[PDB]
Amino acid sequence: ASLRDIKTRINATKKTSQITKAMEMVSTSKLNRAEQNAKSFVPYMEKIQEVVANVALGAGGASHPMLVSRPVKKTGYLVITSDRGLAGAYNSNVLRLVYQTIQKRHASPDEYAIIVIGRVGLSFFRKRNMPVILDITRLPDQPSFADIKEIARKTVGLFADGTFDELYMYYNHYVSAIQQEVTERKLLPLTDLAENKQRTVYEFEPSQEEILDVLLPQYAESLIYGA
């Protein structure tokens, strides 16, 4: 109960408080920048979704391998995690969801496949003895399309090569600054596609089939980047 021990404990706690406050303000600035990036990105998503909904309904345009359901034999998983911690339950929730989904109905080691975005998820899956396909890490704090254009193109191509008949992705959705959701969905299999009631038939310079062939990967990449 000496005064010196109490004084040194007070000093250490004060220094830790300084560290935490500094990190808090830096994170507020980064949140502002990330919101700017997302809101700047949205218009292209709006336009491409409108165009694809306009073209891919009626007047034929069916039987596309990217849009027709297929007997599933191998499944792939895409997860978006972080690189370092200091985030409360941001990584653990999504990793727990992925682990429980895999251990539910994915018994065969060759049945499933994983591709990660964050180093935390990669280390998690290494410790848990699962096989990965690709790993990208050290992504910047304000990433854009050119950062993992190649990774996304490789993913959509390997699905197009027939490796996985089903594709799934798991990530965190920003509801508010405090509330945070953990969401999941199929991406590439495209069992259900959206539609709009303002469609225009238009004309097809390369015909509908080739038009869809070139269009669909852009849709996949745009959805990935929105997530």
Partner: protein, 119 residues
């Protein structure tokens, strides 16, 4: 009298391991207080998970305390205590709620109390 040649060899190892896990849990109290449980390694979370159970299983219900609470009271021989703490340290009862360990005599009573709790 806590010597290997006086009480035995199993007893000594069990007691030393229990004390080691309690000390390790004691070392992590400040960082849990400030940061939280989300910034720990897997081994540290396992240490905390077993330490809370051990600390709750060190309690008991007494004969002379019946007029306060109501439970009749318990008596446990040495071998049963060593067996129970050996099972706890082995991760045999890691799925039960941490509250089922409070104020019981033996570990079979822990199992019964967890069963009556809906688990």
């Amino acid at each position: 009298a806590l010597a290997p040649e006086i009480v035995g060899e199993e007893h000594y190892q069990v007691a030393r391991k229990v004390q080691q896990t309690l000390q390790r849990y004691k070392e992590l109290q400040d960082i849990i207080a400030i940061l939280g449980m989300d910034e720990l390694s897997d081994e540290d979370k396992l240490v905390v998970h077993r330490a809370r159970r051990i600390q709750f299983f060190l309690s008991q219900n007494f004969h002379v305390a019946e007029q306060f609470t109501g439970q009749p009271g318990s008596y446990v021989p040495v071998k049963e205590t060593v067996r129970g703490f050996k099972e706890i340290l082995e991760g045999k009862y890691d799925h039960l709620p941490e509250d089922a360990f409070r104020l019981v005599g033996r570990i079979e009573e822990v199992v019964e109390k967890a069963k009556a709790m809906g688990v």
